[PDB]
Amino acid sequence: ISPIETVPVKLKPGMDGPKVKQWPLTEEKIKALVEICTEMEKEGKISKIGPENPYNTPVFAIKKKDSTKWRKLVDFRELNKRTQDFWEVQLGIPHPAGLKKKKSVTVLDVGDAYFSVPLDEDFRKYTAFTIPSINNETPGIRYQYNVLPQGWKGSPAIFQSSMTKILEPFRKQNPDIVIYQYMDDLYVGSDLEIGQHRTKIEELRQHLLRWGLTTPDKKHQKEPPFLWMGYELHPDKWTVQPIVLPEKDSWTVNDIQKLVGKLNWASQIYPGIKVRQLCKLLRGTKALTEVIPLTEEAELELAENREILKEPVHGVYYDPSKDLIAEIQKQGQGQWTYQIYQEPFKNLKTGKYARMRGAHTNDVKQLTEAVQKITTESIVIWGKTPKFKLPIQKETWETWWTEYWQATWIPEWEFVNTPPLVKLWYQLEKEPIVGAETFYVDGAANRETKLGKAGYVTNRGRQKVVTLTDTTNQKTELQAIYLALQDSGLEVNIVTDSQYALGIIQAQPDQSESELVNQIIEQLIKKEKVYLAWVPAH
Amino acid sequence: ETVPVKLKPGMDGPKVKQWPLTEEKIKALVEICTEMEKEGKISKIGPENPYNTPVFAIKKKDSTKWRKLVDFRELNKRTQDFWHPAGLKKKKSVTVLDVGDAYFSVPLDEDFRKYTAFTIPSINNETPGIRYQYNVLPQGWKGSPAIFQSSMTKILEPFRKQNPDIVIYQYMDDLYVGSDLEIGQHRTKIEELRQHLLRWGLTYELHPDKWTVQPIVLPEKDSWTVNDIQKLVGKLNWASQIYPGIKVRQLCKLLRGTKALTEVIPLTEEAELELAENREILKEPVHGVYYDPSKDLIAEIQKQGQGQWTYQIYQEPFKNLKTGKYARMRGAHTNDVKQLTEAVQKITTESIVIWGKTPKFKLPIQKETWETWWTEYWQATWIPEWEFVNTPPLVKLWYQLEKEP
Numbered sequence A: 001i002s003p004i005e006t007v008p009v010k011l012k013p014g015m016d017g018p019k020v021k022q023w024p025l026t027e028e029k030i031k032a033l034v035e036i037c038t039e040m041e042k043e044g045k046i047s048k049i050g051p052e053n054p055y056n057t058p059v060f061a062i063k064k065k066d067s068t069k070w071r072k073l074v075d076f077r078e079l080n081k082r083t084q085d086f087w088e089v090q091l092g093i094p095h096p097a098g099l100k101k102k103k104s105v106t107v108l109d110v111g112d113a114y115f116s117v118p119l120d121e122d123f124r125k126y127t128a129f130t131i132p133s134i135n136n137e138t139p140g141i142r143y144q145y146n147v148l149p150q151g152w153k154g155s156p157a158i159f160q161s162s163m164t165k166i167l168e169p170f171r172k173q174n175p176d177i178v179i180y181q182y183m184d185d186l187y188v189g190s191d192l193e194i195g196q197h198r199t200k201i202e203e204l205r206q207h208l209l210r211w212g213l214t215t216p217d218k219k220h221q222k223e224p225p226f227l228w229m230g231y232e233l234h235p236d237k238w239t240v241q242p243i244v245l246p247e248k249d250s251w252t253v254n255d256i257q258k259l260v261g262k263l264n265w266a267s268q269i270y271p272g273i274k275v276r277q278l279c280k281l282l283r284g285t286k287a288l289t290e291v292i293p294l295t296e297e298a299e300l301e302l303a304e305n306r307e308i309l310k311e312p313v314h315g316v317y318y319d320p321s322k323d324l325i326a327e328i329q330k331q332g333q334g335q336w337t338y339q340i341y342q343e344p345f346k347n348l349k350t351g352k353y354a355r356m357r358g359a360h361t362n363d364v365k366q367l368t369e370a371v372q373k374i375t376t377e378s379i380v381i382w383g384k385t386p387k388f389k390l391p392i393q394k395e396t397w398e399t400w401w402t403e404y405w406q407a408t409w410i411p412e413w414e415f416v417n418t419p420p421l422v423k424l425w426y427q428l429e430k431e432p433i434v435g436a437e438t439f440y441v442d443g444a445a446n447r448e449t450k451l452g453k454a455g456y457v458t459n460r461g462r463q464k465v466v467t468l469t470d471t472t473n474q475k476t477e478l479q480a481i482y483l484a485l486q487d488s489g490l491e492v493n494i495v496t497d498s499q500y501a502l503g504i505i506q507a508q509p510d511q512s513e514s515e516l517v518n519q520i521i522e523q524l525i526k527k528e529k530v531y532l533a534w535v536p537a538h
Numbered sequence B: 001e002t003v004p005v006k007l008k009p010g011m012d013g014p015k016v017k018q019w020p021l022t023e024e025k026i027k028a029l030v031e032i033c034t035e036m037e038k039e040g041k042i043s044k045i046g047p048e049n050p051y052n053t054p055v056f057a058i059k060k061k062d063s064t065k066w067r068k069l070v071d072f073r074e075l076n077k078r079t080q081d082f083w084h085p086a087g088l089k090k091k092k093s094v095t096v097l098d099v100g101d102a103y104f105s106v107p108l109d110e111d112f113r114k115y116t117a118f119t120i121p122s123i124n125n126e127t128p129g130i131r132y133q134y135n136v137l138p139q140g141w142k143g144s145p146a147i148f149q150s151s152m153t154k155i156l157e158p159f160r161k162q163n164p165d166i167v168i169y170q171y172m173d174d175l176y177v178g179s180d181l182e183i184g185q186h187r188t189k190i191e192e193l194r195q196h197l198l199r200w201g202l203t204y205e206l207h208p209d210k211w212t213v214q215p216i217v218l219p220e221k222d223s224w225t226v227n228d229i230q231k232l233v234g235k236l237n238w239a240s241q242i243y244p245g246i247k248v249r250q251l252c253k254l255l256r257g258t259k260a261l262t263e264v265i266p267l268t269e270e271a272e273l274e275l276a277e278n279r280e281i282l283k284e285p286v287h288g289v290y291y292d293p294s295k296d297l298i299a300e301i302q303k304q305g306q307g308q309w310t311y312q313i314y315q316e317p318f319k320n321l322k323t324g325k326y327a328r329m330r331g332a333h334t335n336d337v338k339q340l341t342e343a344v345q346k347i348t349t350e351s352i353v354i355w356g357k358t359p360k361f362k363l364p365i366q367k368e369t370w371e372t373w374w375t376e377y378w379q380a381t382w383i384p385e386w387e388f389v390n391t392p393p394l395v396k397l398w399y400q401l402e403k404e405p
């Protein structure tokens, strides 16, 4: 236990503590639980109680991995759903990119921390459980927790709070030391030389000791590159630890999906990772346990991925005195790749955004979106926005943004000519084209029969009408425009009453959800001049 | 003593997540908060408090001194209720003052404090956020000016009698002082009010009478083309939703035939009359439009382009209480989000001056874009409600047609 002020804990609005009955156990499990509970009882962690407590939680008995030593587990599942809500613990852990390079680093372990912090003496009654007796007869041994129970809702939050009160003094005393709380770990790093550093750590540890929190043993210590969730942190940089692809000549849907999972994650760091042919195998699958044979094409990319993954990708740490730069590349329609670095080729982080298969958009809009995503990301990691290097001419940007119906913006940036460059695939004319043919287009369809016609009549006498089956009115209207485009020269004036194409005039999209609009886009791109005019229908 | 404030029946405290802040902002908030902590205004809170309200650091006109600004919008909406000058709008010049600094003097009901819980974030989340709660009346909280009303009128009276030709209005942390005196005598009288305000505990202007109701001007031309007529008809047709007397028939008849867009069409006398009648109708605002205090005020804005923006304030679709245009301010040349924020603030100040409440905005900007950069250009103490929308191609086209000098 410890001499720290307890946190006032209460139950949700109007509820009562759990009253679940004790699961029946054997003489073996019981005898085990009894000894453990006698120990904890003396360590001060729990206290023997009695009838003055209607609450109860089921205690259980389990042994640990490839081994044998009876441990214990209390199912606070119920108490949890009845305990008040607490402040949200850091769900977003730091990222190596935002870590400042510290000359010396040290990670302490305070696993027992939970059972070291006292429980609100008022709330304690709710943590009562019972060690059963030999086959539902003699009353069992009753107890309750006096410390933060493992598995209980508020424990992580309360422990984190306590750790903060305790660390506040030390932190103030010597600000050149950076402490990080994570689970039962404290990652203390500084710019001091190893000797001075070790001295501070001992001071820190001894400080915690005064507060009841004991640290690691010569055995239970974390030494080499800190394997911090998929990353190995070295002094000079951080690396991506092995993401192994299994060699199985038998792949189930599960095996393929999981694989694609790993591969997709790998797409953020490793350049070139592809899963198209893998995903292809999922088509019409009838069960997780179904074995789908890898097509030659799948066996090939899997092989390439295996090679790409066996490459030494490594990141660097953050230096506040240096600029934050982010460069973006358009890896195909909708997909964008980026890398944020301070000094050339030394990336702090890389990543790519899959493509929001949108209803109706354009590259410049998408470039913007990637930019905003990166910014928020940067603000959260470095508390700063980067200088952008975008594969788009200022001229392209100016022309687009300055006339878009929606407020859009890109922070301080600079053009970097690294093909392919994002651009405006076409621009609708500002005024009618003198000389060019004028198509009066119209498509009408019976929404119920899904039968319609799409045609036009030009000022030059050209005319056409097409009958369509299983269509919709929107499709006919759009199709009308399509024909107009197909049958016209390099300069066209088109008038329609489809205020749905009026949407195209304002936004001028270069990609859509519908194949039809896409075709129209392909046509638009092909002309030298196109003037779209809308007129109220009927 | 402390007044027992409570939440509206059934409502729980706000649990709004704190948006990430820039390093500069965090440092500024920390300093500010340490001070207020020392001054006993706010206190560190524990994990037993699940509530939260956004906080950010602004800057306004005149300083580097970062001002702390909390987004109490949710708390305000959850705070119990505690139940306007018609001449303020007809004043030559109105000045705004930040009387938010007065609330720290009054303590907040202990049992309510938990709900004011806010949090200063940490970069890369290397440190848990610094949690605090208010012990005094918070700035930006609706309950503040209310509770402090007794004291407020008291301190204001002496100036009001010395100058009852001047109108003083209080909204949130603000005070709008409108007078009919000329600029110099007006401002000199305002500083007189401030000096008077300073011997207690706190620290340019508008011109309401200038807000002219601008009409719609229809194009006139030597020659009209098929396209010109078509564009005119489209807009007129849309306008019939407001003025049902507008007609496009005679004009539409000129549009009979598959002719070249660039072809010139001679206007028939009948069509000419129609255009004339239409111009007469658009010469004045639609009748029967009146403000209903029991209804939400709405503000829609459209990006006209080239730094121009149009807006309309209404409650019922098409029955506009006011319509206007905003040109970008010197400096905002490459920033839309700045122009928009500046616009929202300007439009909101008018709404307050005129109806004494903030309208609900329909902003032509992507949620993400807005939330990421609005604060960087925010300067007002209050924060209006907002929704993000897709601006219809015609609504823009019509208001673009508004009359200019």
Ligand SMILES: CC(C)Nc1cccnc1N1CCN(C(=O)c2cc3cc(NS(C)(=O)=O)ccc3[nH]2)CC1
Pocket (backbone or CB within 6 Å): A094, A099, A100, A101, A102, A103, A104, A105, A178, A179, A180, A187, A188, A189, A223, A224, A225, A226, A228, A233, A234, A235, A236, A317
């Ligand atoms: C828990 C996360 C958030 N990290 C972390 C938390 C709190 C403070 N600082 C941190 N990091 C800063 C960046 N960083 C280094 O600069 C670094 C690694 C390193 C390794 C050795 N030696 S070794 C063990 O054999 O690899 C010697 C010197 C070193 N310096 C790793 C630690």
